[PDB]
Amino acid sequence: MGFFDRLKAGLAKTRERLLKAIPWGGNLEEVLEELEMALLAADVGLSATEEILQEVRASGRKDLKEAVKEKLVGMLEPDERRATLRKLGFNPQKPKPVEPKGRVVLVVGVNGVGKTTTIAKLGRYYQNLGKKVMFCAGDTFRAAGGTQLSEWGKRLSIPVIQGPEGTDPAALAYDAVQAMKARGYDLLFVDTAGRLHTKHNLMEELKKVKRAIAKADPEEPKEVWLVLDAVTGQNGLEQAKKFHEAVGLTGVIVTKLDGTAKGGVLIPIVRTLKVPIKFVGVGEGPDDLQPFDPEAFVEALLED
Ligand SMILES: Nc1nc2c(ncn2[C@@H]2O[C@H](COP(=O)(O)OP(=O)(O)NP(=O)(O)O)[C@@H](O)[C@H]2O)c(=O)[nH]1
């Protein structure tokens, strides 16, 4: 319960079509059939679905339902260690806290996916874990109404490195790291432009920003997080590929899970990018941005 409730609520649209209604009592032939449709309807994809079936049908010689759960969780965990600790019984009440590998987190993704809002929630999250957090408003470009990262910073008391619209994004991020160092901050999130059809090639700007961060601190950024909208589609995964090829993702944040019945998309995402989902977005609330936990996610896909 508690956050678990918020997760189940966020996955309700995906869950209540067929997943929860699966008749785990009938003769396999029916159940597995219903299972394949439920998966495909949730956007798990044919590839991962036919593998799940194999894993269960061929193998899966334990409890039918549990076999499914274990297989789905296995598909969501890119890290062998955690997969192992899980199999060994590790299953704490609430998911462990996501610790950035370093001090700088470069945030990327296409315009509109919710990068700005996601960073603000991340600031809160980390602040509540006692980190001194700083923001860099690397997307000086587009504002057009909405709420700037700049306004979010004042509200959380998080300083925002920013410059006049048009300011060199790379020089901003450089100043941002310098500032984070001199003032002794624990974490810096660098927001970035997300428009793929301007006169300035997005991927190239991005690489110039990551390079600037490195010039300031040769170890950074230790995290490159792509934000993906669960409502987009497979084009968004293709874009993901380009972002990965351009800057090397270390993680993925999936937002707007509450707005779709295709939440099963997380499986294809992790299988394609082979990086972990760090946080999942279950709504437009402050604490709606939660640390990802495969076990919990899978449970919410099937239960409640
Ligand atoms: N329902 C839902 N909405 C979300 C989630 N995350 C972000 N959003 C919403 O998505 C919209 C775009 O957010 P924003 O942070 O402005 O996006 P951007 O990707 O930063 N766009 P811009 O380039 O215009 O600054 C907002 O209305 C925001 O609340 C989520 O997990 N669920």
CA dihedral angle for residue 233, residue 239, residue 241, residue 247, rounded to 10 degrees? -140
Q: Does residue 257 contact residue 10 with C-beta atoms inside 8 Å?
A: yes
Mutational test site, ligand 1, from 6, 13, 14, 116, max ligand atoms within 8 Å of CB:
116
Q: Does residue 203 contact residue 108 with C-beta atoms inside 8 Å?
A: no
> Does the beta carbon of 256 lie inside 6 Å of ligand 1?
yes
Domains with residue ranges and CATH for the chain: 1-89+292-304 (1.20.120.140), 102-291 (3.40.50.300)
The residue nearest atom 14 of ligand 1, judged by CA position, is 114
Q: Which residues, at least 6 apart from 27, have a Cβ–Cβ distance to it below 8 Å? A: none
The residue nearest atom 2 of ligand 1, judged by CA position, is 256
> Does the beta carbon of 294 lie inside 6 Å of ligand 1?
no
Please give the Cα distance from 126 to 123 (Å, whole number): 5
Signed CA dihedral, 126, 131, 136, 137: sign only: positive
Q: How far is CA 54 from CA 25, 51, 113, 263, in A?
A: 20, 5, 35, 22
Task: Please name the method used to determine this structure.
Answer: X-ray
Q: Does residue 113 contact residue 194 with C-beta atoms inside 8 Å?
A: yes
Instruction: Let me know how many helices (H) and strands (E) the chain has, helices first.
Output: 13, 8
Resolution for this PDB entry, in angstroms: 2.2
Task: List own/partner pairs for 244-248 with CB under 8 A and 24 or more apart.
Answer: 244/273, 244/275, 245/203, 246/203, 246/204, 246/206, 246/207, 247/106, 247/108, 247/203, 247/206, 247/207, 247/210, 248/224
b/e map of 8-17 (b: 16 or more CB within 10 Å)? bbbbbbbbee
Rg (alpha carbons) of the chain, rounded to whole number = 20
Q: How many Cα atoms sit within 13 Å of 213 on the Cβ side?
A: 29
